[PDB]
Amino acid sequence: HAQLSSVLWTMTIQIAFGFRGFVGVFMTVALFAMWFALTCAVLVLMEGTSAMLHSLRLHWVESMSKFFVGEGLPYEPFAFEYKDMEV
Amino acid sequence: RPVVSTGKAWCCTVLSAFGVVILSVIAHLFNTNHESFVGSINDPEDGPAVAHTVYLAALVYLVFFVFCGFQVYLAR
Amino acid sequence: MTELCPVYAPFFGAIGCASAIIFTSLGAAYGTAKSGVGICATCVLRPDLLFKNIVPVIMAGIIAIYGLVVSVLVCYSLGQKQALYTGFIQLGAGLSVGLSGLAAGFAIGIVGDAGVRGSSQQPRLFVGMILILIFAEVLGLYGLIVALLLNSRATQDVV
Amino acid sequence: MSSFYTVVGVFIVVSAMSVLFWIMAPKNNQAVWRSTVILTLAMMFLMWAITFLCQLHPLVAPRRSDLRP
Amino acid sequence: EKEEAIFRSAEMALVQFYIPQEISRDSAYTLGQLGLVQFRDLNSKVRAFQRTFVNEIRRLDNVERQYRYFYSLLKKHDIKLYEGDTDKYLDGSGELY
Amino acid sequence: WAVDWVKDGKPAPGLLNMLINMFLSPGTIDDELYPHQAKVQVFLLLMALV
Amino acid sequence: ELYAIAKELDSWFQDVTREKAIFEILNKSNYDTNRKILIAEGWIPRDELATLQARLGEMIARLGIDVPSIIQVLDTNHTPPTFHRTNKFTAGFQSICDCYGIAQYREINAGLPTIVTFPFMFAIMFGDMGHGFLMTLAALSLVLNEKKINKMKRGEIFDMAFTGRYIILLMGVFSMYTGFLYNDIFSKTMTIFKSGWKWPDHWKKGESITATSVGTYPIGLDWAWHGTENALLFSNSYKMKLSILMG
């Protein structure tokens, strides 16, 4: 994550650091418009999503090995509860 | 509703809001020196004062930001 | 240059590091190709079981970085003025770890793609499934352990 | 502070606060805090404990971004 | 009192019943209101067609059939439904009322 | 963090590797980490057999 | 006719459903002709061993002739079930904990450990102030607007995403914490905690100007570690050591 963030930052911000103020202002505007979208969506979403379940499974395999000596059995106490269906 | 906001107006507002805080900090680190974006053997050198361009960049963002705010504030 | 630090010894670092990365990458890809298609049946059959089914592919993922870590580790041991002895040992370690990971991916995927079916009718069958599966990435771990030893011998012994 | 005495001296505050709040806590969900907050703070302490840099062996990184700011 | 039961695990006490049938259905609200419980049914070795309630549910189900029949025609022409107003208040939080 | 071998001149182990000294070699430190290690290394290795 | 009926058919459907359900519940019981005795069994919380009898008090005063209809119990060795609750504040946490599996009676469940543990390990995955900041802002908007949005439906997966505001915020707080611990706004440093490193004032543009430990910030890891790849090696070795330690 550190390397990918750094390389994206370089190849966007430093390019934006190029000196052109007449129409290059529009160049930098478009550059940042792209960079923000990338660095949020394609740089966070899949990363974190793929990341969390790793820790989750590690917790499972490194603790439940010592905690689940077995499985219990569910209860979910019931009562009258509202439902709605339509055709 | 003066103007339709469902046309991804929230996107314009948020991006415009985020497109000025960065301008502030880059202007600061241009005028100021942190040897991280203005001072280096390879740093492009127009002097540590190019904050004019970034200061200019804010207005175009803010125009659309406020214009979309006008239509979207009715939902709060 | 000389037989101790010639012009071709740096080539070992130039290439030797890119070995394990590719073997583990291909092993993980093959493991996915095998197991992932498995969900496509049971999900429609019984969407209930959707979590227990994913463990093997993530085990393959765990293996997938065994090669990347060693590659980046040795990435500094190389240079234009290193010794060909270091290149030899680095190449040997990278090949060993990467191919071992590829074999682990083979074994884990080719068993998970069927364990997905096995557990479909028996939601609690995965008890032995995990017991069998763990061995594959454990074997990958033995595959990668000796790379550290050789690189330690590759970061202090030269010429 | 920064020395070998620093960590050993500062380990006591977390234990003191835990035992304190292990006795007193919000009545609603009385035991959830009594069970969780201790680790909630111990985690803080423990990952800070390692970033503490002092008495270091290896070399520092040479810099190559010099232009006389 | 309150037991976390998430740093531990729980246990629900079974109860023996010899309730006379004379309060069979009028007492339905007893557990219909806030029953918040589970059962271990004893009716085994005998099936719907072999048990009793099957008979009335056979007359009941027809009403649901005709209701969902109506729903199509109701939505058919131009109009909507106010939805269950009871659902907002009748199922108001958890009540004994 | 306990002790530095270059702030005060002393032999040092590798940045991370001090391992095989326990396993193949019985009760040898061979890396200058701490004196009583030479004696307690065999103990640490041995109480895991029974 | 349609106007008149519409206002009430929905209520009628609710009814039929409710009485239907209770009829099946009744159907879960036993009857006999000669002896007027009804039979059923339900498992009651250990802590509710007496309150629900007072509750049966709410179905006697006028609805049953001082009717518990039974209060004496004969118990069987059949394994009573267990239970766990999410404390109405960490639903997603415990749900994801238990969907993987369950455990036997009176055993220490691991629901609470997950809440404190998992989010920080996820956080240290990226540890960037901007990233965690934006995602926590999204989670804050979600939890603020759920006062009205909880009822409107979303995309099938978008609904589940809505269902995890607490989890998102918990991971994000640790994300900012670790990112600040690492001084990286997209791998960018802002530290003014200079503590002393050999930086000779005379440098040739290109000369490998090195340094040495002439003073350390107690936290360390400051901007000064932004240099040659020696910085990368130091950081990576330190981080792998930290991972081993925490593990």
Curated annotation (Swiss-Prot), chain B:
Source domain of life: Eukaryota
Keywords: Endoplasmic reticulum, Membrane, Transmembrane, Transmembrane helix, Vacuole
Topology of the protein relative to the lipid bilayer: Multi-pass membrane protein
KW Lyase (keyword) present: no
Cytoplasmic side: 31-53
GO BP term, example: vacuolar acidification
Function according to Swiss-Prot or TrEMBL: Accessory component of the V0 complex of vacuolar(H+)-ATPase (V-ATPase), a multisubunit enzyme composed of a peripheral complex (V1) that hydrolyzes ATP and a membrane integral complex (V0) that translocates protons. V-ATPase is responsible for acidifying and maintaining the pH of intracellular compartments.
Name of the protein described by the UniProt record: V-type proton ATPase subunit f
Organism field: Saccharomyces cerevisiae (strain ATCC 204508 / S288c) (Baker's yeast)
From Swiss-Prot, chain D:
Alphabetized InterPro entries for the sequence: ATPase_V0-cplx_e1/e2_su
Bilayer disposition of the protein: Multi-pass membrane protein
Assembly and binders: V-ATPase is a heteromultimeric enzyme composed of a peripheral catalytic V1 complex (components A to H) attached to an integral membrane V0 proton pore complex (components: a, c, c', c'', d, e, f and VOA1).
Annotated TM spans: 4-24, 36-56
Subcellular location: Vacuole membrane
Record topological domains on the Cytoplasmic side: 25-35
Functional summary from the UniProt entry: Subunit of the V0 complex of vacuolar(H+)-ATPase (V-ATPase), a multisubunit enzyme composed of a peripheral complex (V1) that hydrolyzes ATP and a membrane integral complex (V0) that translocates protons. V-ATPase is responsible for acidifying and maintaining the pH of intracellular compartments.
GO cellular component, one term: fungal-type vacuole membrane
Regions of this protein lying in the Lumenal compartment: 1-3, 57-69
GO molecular function: ATPase-coupled ion transmembrane transporter activity; proton-transporting ATPase activity, rotational mechanism
Name listed for the protein in its UniProt record: V-type proton ATPase subunit e
Top-level taxon: Eukaryota
Pfam families according to UniProt: ATP_synt_H
UniProt keywords, alphabetically: Hydrogen ion transport, Ion transport, Membrane, Transmembrane, Transmembrane helix, Transport, Vacuole
Family to which this protein belongs: Belongs to the V-ATPase e1/e2 subunit family.
Disulfide bond residue pairs: none
GO annotation, biological process: cell wall mannoprotein biosynthetic process; endosomal lumen acidification; Golgi lumen acidification; protein-containing complex assembly; proton transmembrane transport; transmembrane transport; vacuolar acidification
Protein source organism: Saccharomyces cerevisiae (strain ATCC 204508 / S288c)
UniProtKB/Swiss-Prot annotation, chain E:
UniProt modification remark: Glycosylated.
Localization per Swiss-Prot or TrEMBL: Vacuole membrane
Function as written in the Swiss-Prot or TrEMBL entry: Subunit of the V0 complex of vacuolar(H+)-ATPase (V-ATPase), a multisubunit enzyme composed of a peripheral complex (V1) that hydrolyzes ATP and a membrane integral complex (V0) that translocates protons. V-ATPase is responsible for acidifying and maintaining the pH of intracellular compartments. Is present only in vacuolar V-ATPase complexes; enzymes containing this subunit have a 4-fold higher ratio of proton transport to ATP hydrolysis than complexes containing the Golgi/endosomal isoform and undergo reversible dissociation of V1 and V0 in response to glucose depletion.
Miscellaneous remark of the record: Present with 55714 molecules/cell in log phase SD medium.
UniProt family annotation: Belongs to the V-ATPase 116 kDa subunit family.
Subunit organization: V-ATPase is a heteromultimeric enzyme composed of a peripheral catalytic V1 complex (components A to H) attached to an integral membrane V0 proton pore complex (components: a, c, c', c'', d, e, f and VOA1).
Protein name: V-type proton ATPase subunit a, vacuolar isoform
Gene symbol of the encoding locus: VPH1
Boundaries of the shown chain within the full protein: 3 to 99 of 840
Swiss-Prot record, chain G:
Cytoplasmic compartment spans: 146-159
Protein's UniProt keywords contain Cell membrane: no
Localization per record: Vacuole membrane
Key word Secreted present: no
Gene Ontology MF terms in the entry: ATPase binding; phosphatidylinositol-3,5-bisphosphate binding; proton-transporting ATPase activity, rotational mechanism
Outcome recorded upon mutating D128N: Reduces assembly of V-ATPase complexes and reduces ATPase activity of the assembled complexes
TM annotation in the entry: 108-126, 129-145, 160-189
Keywords: Acetylation, Coiled coil, Glycoprotein, Hydrogen ion transport, Ion transport, Membrane, Transmembrane, Transmembrane helix, Transport, Vacuole
Cellular component, GO annotation: fungal-type vacuole; fungal-type vacuole membrane; membrane raft; vacuolar proton-transporting V-type ATPase complex; vacuolar proton-transporting V-type ATPase, V0 domain
Topology, Vacuolar side: 127-128, 190-237
Gene Ontology biological-process entries: cellular hyperosmotic response; cellular response to alkaline pH; polyphosphate metabolic process; protein localization to vacuolar membrane; protein-containing complex assembly; proton transmembrane transport; vacuolar acidification
Record's comment on post-translational modification: Glycosylated.
Protein family membership: Belongs to the V-ATPase 116 kDa subunit family.
Note: Present with 55714 molecules/cell in log phase SD medium.
Subunit structure as annotated in this protein's UniProt entry: V-ATPase is a heteromultimeric enzyme composed of a peripheral catalytic V1 complex (components A to H) attached to an integral membrane V0 proton pore complex (components: a, c, c', c'', d, e, f and VOA1).
Protein name from the UniProt record: V-type proton ATPase subunit a, vacuolar isoform
Residues of the full protein shown: 298 to 544 of 840
